[PDB]
Symmetry: C3
Subunit: 29 residues, 3 copies
């Protein structure tokens, strides 16, 4: 339970960082 | 409290995928 | 461990809100 929830939070954190960088790319063209 | 944390993570994973797809759309016009 | 999970989720929810606001500003503004 705990370990699966921690994995899902880490995957969201990684997606979170990738979407931030992608939104920054789109702002600059 | 644990169940609520999981329902909140599930809503956030759905919002995460929604933002990812909208960013993909914006990227292409 | 509990506090760290709750903190990560609040930070992700907050980042989710910041990223949606930037996306709306880029798409429409
Ligand atoms: Cl359920
Ligand atoms: Cl998120
Ligand atoms: Na509980
Ligand atoms: Na632990
Ligand atoms: Zn559970
Ligand atoms: Zn920016
Ligand atoms: Zn793509
Ligand atoms: Zn493409
Ligand atoms: Zn932990
Ligand atoms: Zn997010």
């Amino acid at each position: 339970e705990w370990e699966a929830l921690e994995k899902k939070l880490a995957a969201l954190e990684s997606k979170x960082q990738a979407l931030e960088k992608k939104l920054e790319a789109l702002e600059h063209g």
